[PDB]
C-alpha cells in the first residue's frame, strides 16, 4: 500500500503513452514493454502516477501495487536493459545458442527443438552459460521458466538451471 502511493517519475527520453488502462512504455533500444491495470485506475499526470479505485469494481490495493511495479520494471527494461546472466549445473545438459535455437540434451532420440521467442535474442560465452538480450523483464524469465520446468533446482544435490528465486536447500545422504 506504500507502493500504490509512489509517483514513479519516469526518466528523461522514455515515452509512457496512456490509452487509460493499457499503459505503454517506449524509448531507445526496444519495443512492446507494457503494463495493464484492470481493477484500478492509473492516471499518468505530467509524470506523477496516481493510483486509485475504478468504476464497476469493489476490489482494492490488488492491481494498484502491480501496475506501479510492472511499469517501473518496463521503464528500466528500455532505459538500462534488464540482467542477462544465466547458467546451469549438471553434466551433459548444455544451453548452447545457435541463432534462434537453444541446443540441449534431455537424453532424447528426437531433437528437442527448444527455441527462443522471435521477440528475444541470446548468445553464449561457453556451452553451458547463456547471455539473453532484450528490454522486457517478463520474457527472459518466461523462456528460462519453460527451460527449467522439469529441470528445476532439486532439493538434494542442487542440479538445475539457475536464475532468480531458487528453492534448493541441500541435503546430505541417508546413513549407511
Amino acid at each position: 500500500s506504500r507502493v500504490a502511493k509512489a509517483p514513479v517519475v519516469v526518466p528523461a527520453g522514455v515515452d509512457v503513452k496512456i490509452n487509460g488502462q493499457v499503459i505503454t512504455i517506449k524509448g531507445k533500444n526496444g519495443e512492446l514493454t507494457r503494463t495493464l491495470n484492470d481493477a484500478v485506475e492509473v492516471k499518468h499526470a505530467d509524470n506523477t502516477l496516481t493510483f486509485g479505485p475504478r468504476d464497476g469494481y469493489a476490489d482494492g490495493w490488488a492491481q494498484a501495487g502491480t501496475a506501479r511495479a510492472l511499469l517501473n520494471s518496463m521503464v528500466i527494461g528500455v532505459t538500462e536493459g534488464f540482467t542477462k546472466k544465466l547458467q546451469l549445473v549438471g553434466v551433459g545438459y548444455r544451453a548452447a545458442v545457435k541463432g534462434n535455437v537453444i541446443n540441449l540434451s534431455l537424453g532424447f532420440s528426437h531433437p528437442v527443438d527448444h527455441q527462443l521467442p522471435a521477440g528475444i535474442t541470446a548468445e553464449c560465452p561457453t556451452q553451458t552459460e547463456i547471455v539473453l538480450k532484450g528490454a522486457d523483464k517478463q520474457v527472459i524469465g518466461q523462456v528460462a521458466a519453460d527451460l527449467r520446468a522439469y529441470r528445476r533446482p532439486e532439493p538434494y544435490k542442487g542440479k538445475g538451471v539457475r536464475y532468480a528465486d531458487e528453492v534448493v536447500r541441500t541435503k546430505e545422504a541417508k546413513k549407511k
Binding site: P155, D165, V167, R169
Partner: protein, 38 residues
Amino acid sequence: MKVRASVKKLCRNCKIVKRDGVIRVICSAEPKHKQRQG
C-alpha cells in the same frame, strides 16, 4: 505432500496463497510443503 483440508503454516516461510477457490500452502524454503487443498 498430503492433499488435506484446513490450511496451516507448516514453517515460517509457508506464505499461504489463494489460487482459485482453494487456499494452497506455497513455500520458497522447501518443496515438501506444497499442500493441494486448504
